[PDB]
Design an enzyme around this catalytic site. Structure first.
Site, short mmCIF file in Angstrom:
data_model
loop_
_atom_site.label_atom_id
_atom_site.label_comp_id
_atom_site.label_asym_id
_atom_site.label_seq_id
_atom_site.Cartn_x
_atom_site.Cartn_y
_atom_site.Cartn_z
N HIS A 1 0.84 -1.23 0.00
CA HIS A 1 0.00 0.00 0.00
C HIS A 1 0.85 1.25 0.00
CE1 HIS A 1 0.45 0.74 4.50
NE2 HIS A 1 -0.02 1.94 4.20
N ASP B 1 -0.05 -7.39 2.08
CA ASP B 1 0.64 -6.08 2.10
C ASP B 1 2.11 -6.24 2.32
OD1 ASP B 1 0.44 -3.27 1.98
OD2 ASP B 1 0.20 -3.00 4.06
N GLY C 1 2.76 6.73 8.97
CA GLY C 1 4.17 7.14 8.72
C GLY C 1 5.00 5.91 9.12
N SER D 1 4.07 2.66 8.39
CA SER D 1 3.85 1.55 7.41
C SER D 1 5.11 1.02 6.72
CB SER D 1 2.93 2.02 6.31
OG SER D 1 1.68 2.36 6.90
N1 LIG Z 1 -2.39 2.31 13.87
C1 LIG Z 1 -1.47 1.65 13.21
N2 LIG Z 1 -0.92 0.59 13.75
C2 LIG Z 1 -1.05 2.09 11.96
C3 LIG Z 1 0.17 1.63 11.38
C4 LIG Z 1 0.62 2.08 10.15
C5 LIG Z 1 -0.20 2.95 9.47
N3 LIG Z 1 -0.09 3.52 8.33
C6 LIG Z 1 -1.15 4.27 8.18
C7 LIG Z 1 -1.35 5.03 7.06
C8 LIG Z 1 -2.36 6.02 7.03
C9 LIG Z 1 -2.56 6.81 5.90
C10 LIG Z 1 -1.76 6.63 4.79
C11 LIG Z 1 -0.75 5.64 4.80
O1 LIG Z 1 0.11 5.39 3.74
C12 LIG Z 1 -0.01 6.14 2.52
C13 LIG Z 1 0.95 7.30 2.67
C14 LIG Z 1 1.99 7.18 1.56
C15 LIG Z 1 1.82 5.80 0.95
C16 LIG Z 1 0.47 5.26 1.38
C17 LIG Z 1 -0.55 4.87 5.93
O2 LIG Z 1 0.49 3.94 5.87
N4 LIG Z 1 -2.01 4.22 9.19
C18 LIG Z 1 -1.38 3.39 9.98
C19 LIG Z 1 -1.83 2.97 11.20
#
Ligand SMILES: NC(=[NH2+])c1ccc2[nH]c(-c3cccc(OC4CCCC4)c3[O-])nc2c1
Lengths: 246, 8
Positions: free
Chosen positions: A46, A97, A196, A198
């Site tokens: 993603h 993922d 941030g 991920s």
């Molecule tokens: N609560 C958690 N454990 C969690 C972990 C990783 C996450 N990554 C994200 C996330 C939210 C919005 C957009 C994202 O990626 C996009 C930004 C740039 C590439 C795709 C996220 O990874 N929410 C997240 C929540």
């Protein structure tokens, strides 16, 4: 990361920072990733899905800060970007993922070992730690779900792996969580991964080694009660990884 | 020297 401490890359020498370049001059942070072998970094599909243009991403190894440089860092271009065929997202979860980036430096080389650059180990086919194990997650993601900026220093925190039975409880995630995902939370829901983070790693010790057990994937909110973080269960993707890293 | 996966 909500909670945790600030660390340096010497404490996570396999963590990789992936950025995207923009016309205009800015390069922004996209996701975290981990080094598995000199030329391969593993992260989350993603993170690339809405912009699968490999020439616009930069991967840095040896970085303890987000926008300033660390002495010893290495910069790479993404030579191959392998996303997962069968990647799907629903209202919360991402399935399959996992992604692989093959890195090349402007001189034609891959990563080189240093005190700030090391690979992390892969688990053995479908073998995981038991629930309860404390594993550590690291990355440059949000410190509070209300922040709109990411910290400039690398953070790390410890979280414990929980069971599928506990995570699939109706008042947690029910069936959104599958056998290919792992859930890890803080006993007192105080620290966790957030936006941030991920693509970065969940590292646990398996048979004596520090192994990449999961990839930060999703979660509802950050450090919310009964809302564990969900990670891609790397032990169940070892076939796929091999298929492309041979 | 060379990589030893897992080592800090
Ligand atoms: N609560 C958690 N454990 C969690 C972990 C990783 C996450 N990554 C994200 C996330 C939210 C919005 C957009 C994202 O990626 C996009 C930004 C740039 C590439 C795709 C996220 O990874 N929410 C997240 C929540």
């Amino acid at each position: 990361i909500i909670g945790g401490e600030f660390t340096t890359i010497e404490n996570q020498p396999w963590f990789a920072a992936i950025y995207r370049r923009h016309r205009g001059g800015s390069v922004t942070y996209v996701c975290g990733g981990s080094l598995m072998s000199p030329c391969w970094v593993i992260s989350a599909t993603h993170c690339f899905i809405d912009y699968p243009k490999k020439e616009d991403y930069i991967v840095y190894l040896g970085r303890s800060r987000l926008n300033s440089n660390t002495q010893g860092e290495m910069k790479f271009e993404v030579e191959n970007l392998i996303l997962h065929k069968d990647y799907s997202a629903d209202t919360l979860a991402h399935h399959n993922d996992i992604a692989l980036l093959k890195i090349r430096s402007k001189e034609g080389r891959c990563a080189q070992p240093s005190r700030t650059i090391q690979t992390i180990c892969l688990p053995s086919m479908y073998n995981d730690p038991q629930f309860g194990t404390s594993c550590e997650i690291t990355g440059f993601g949000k410190e509070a779900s209300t922040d709109y900026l990411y910290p400039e220093q690398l953070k790390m925190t410890v979280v414990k792996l929980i069971s599928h039975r506990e995570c699939q409880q109706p008042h947690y995630y029910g069936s959104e969580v599958t056998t290919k995902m792992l859930c890890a939370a803080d006993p007192q829901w105080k620290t966790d991964s957030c936006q941030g983070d991920s693509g970065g790693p969940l590292v646990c010790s398996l048979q004596g080694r520090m192994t990449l057990t999961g990839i930060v994937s999703w979660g509802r909110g950050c450090a919310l009660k009964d809302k564990p973080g969900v990670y891609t269960r790397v032990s169940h993707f070892l076939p796929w990884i091999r298929s492309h890293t041979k | 020297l060379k990589f030893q996966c897992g080592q800090k």
